Design a protein around this ligand. Structure first.
Ligand SMILES: [Cl-]
Length: 240
């Protein structure tokens, strides 16, 4: 058995879970740093695009609290490595649109434990090399242990990611992220999964940055698939 080919084959199966053309969801994010808490409420709109409908466009609209109300992120995430993912943010305080590109992708997303790059396609299969390490029972759940390393030349802050993948739903249960100095930079917990409109979806996450002394908890609700979203939500004009 080839663990590199087996790792890639699993990554492909994982990428087949999302059979939707578009989706809508609502989320609340709570960021904890030394007992101090920041909160954000947002709606996410997503729709598939491209020749084979493999590109994914997303619009993230913040509504609460008052200081972040009106912040919008537009993401044009492309299948393949030929074109870098496009990302823009509309900032309500300066009524400006700013492109997030290059190393800006590694910066914090809305002061959370997520980076701007964490907001793009989590399952871009051909951006990585895989290694299936085996199986392990994690708190009563049977998982595959799947390591993925970014291919040479990929713009990312991570050197490698260890993923615990549920054998039954093919959703991640946990993942460890490593920086360019091989240090553990982030711990992800996919703490809740739900079958929504026939698609097993992560609907709760805890993201920890052990080096920052902070953790983010995100709760998704009112998630729906194939609602018939217009292309207007994903145009550069939807920002300003
Ligand atoms: Cl700019």
């Amino acid at each position: 058995t080839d663990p590199v080919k087996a790792g890639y084959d699993l990554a492909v199966r994982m990428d087949q879970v999302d059979t939707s053309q578009d989706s809508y969801s609502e989320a609340v994010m709570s960021i904890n740093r030394g007992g101090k808490v920041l909160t954000r409420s947002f709606k996410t709109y997503s729709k598939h695009f491209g020749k084979d409908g493999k590109d994914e466009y997303s619009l993230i609209v913040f509504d609460r609290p008052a200081d972040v109300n009106g912040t919008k992120y537009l993401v044009w995430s492309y299948r393949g490595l030929e074109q870098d993912d496009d990302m823009w943010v509309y900032l309500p305080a300066e009524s400006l649109v700013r492109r997030i590109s290059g190393s800006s992708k590694f910066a914090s997303f809305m002061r959370s434990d997520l980076s701007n790059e964490d907001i793009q396609n989590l399952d871009d299969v051909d951006e990585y090399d895989y290694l299936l390490q085996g199986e392990e029972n994690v708190d009563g759940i049977d998982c595959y242990i799947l390591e993925r390393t970014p291919k040479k030349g990929k713009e990312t802050q991570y050197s490698r990611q260890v993923q615990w993948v549920r054998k039954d739903t093919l959703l991640r249960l946990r993942a460890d992220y490593y920086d360019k100095k091989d240090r553990l930079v982030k711990k992800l917990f996919f703490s809740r999964q739900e079958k929504i409109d026939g698609i097993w979806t992560v609907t709760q996450m805890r993201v920890e940055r052990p080096r920052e002394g902070s953790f983010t908890v995100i709760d998704w609700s009112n998630l729906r698939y194939d609602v018939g979203l217009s292309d207007a939500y994903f145009e550069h004009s939807a920002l300003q």
